[PDB]
Design goal:
Length: 217
């Protein structure tokens, strides 16, 4: 196996939300076979961000997911060459984001070239007013559409004041090597948490745990 039980993560994101430009760098570690990762993020340009940091976090690698032997693990099988993904995010009030990640591996480290573009967020809405608290835990449904591995998530952000702000997202995933075999349909349960942050979210520590399963006990 190319993938070690302990791996480092290096990341750069560039993006633009509602016209606001930003650059965020990330440094982290994780355990591919246990489905756990954590990382320190730092805003390098455009800070303090004028929108809810939480909209970014799912863009900050399905290699970090515990797969049982009975499900084909497309992500681990994509290395060393790597893979990329593209995601569209649709929010209940018309906010739309497109994000992509190109993931490579050199030695013990995954490098991530992330781009994130968001538009059409209402100025009075929870994103531009910074009213979000967290993503609720979510299940990603994995299946093949027109020969492309596709994951769908229907989820929500919890807001201040006991309200939820719904978001649907679709991600398509493509190995760089031709001939990595596609898996059968399955599910991946996710939990993502901001562990700590400073005053305006210029520095954030982020954690994710993810487990693949076939839907039964």
């Amino acid at each position: 196996s190319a993938i070690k039980p302990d791996m480092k993560i290096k990341l750069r994101m560039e993006g633009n939300v509602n016209g606001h430009h930003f650059v965020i760098d990330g440094d982290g570690t994780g355990k591919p076979f246990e489905g756990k990762q954590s990382m320190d993020l730092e805003v390098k340009e455009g800070g303090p961000l004028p929108f809810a940091f939480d909209i970014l976090t799912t863009a900050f690698n399905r290699v970090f997911a515990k797969y049982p032997d009975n499900i084909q693990d497309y992500f681990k099988q994509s290395f060393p060459k790597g893979y990329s993904w593209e995601r569209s995010l649709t929010f209940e009030d018309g906010g739309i984001c497109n994000a992509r990640n190109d993931i490579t591996m050199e030695g013990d480290t995954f490098y991530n070239k992330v781009r994130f573009y968001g538009t059409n967020f209402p100025a009075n809405g929870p994103v531009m007013q910074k009213k979000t608290l967290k993503w609720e835990p979510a299940t990603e449904k994995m299946y093949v559409r027109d020969g492309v591995l596709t994951g769908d998530v229907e989820t929500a952000l919890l807001l201040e004041g006991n309200a939820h702000y719904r978001c649907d997202f679709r991600t398509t995933y493509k190995a760089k090597e031709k001939g990595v075999k596609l898996p059968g349909a399955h599910f991946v349960d996710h939990c993502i948490e901001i562990l700590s942050h400073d005053k305006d979210y210029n520095k954030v520590k982020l954690y994710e745990h993810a487990v693949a399963h076939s839907g039964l006990p």
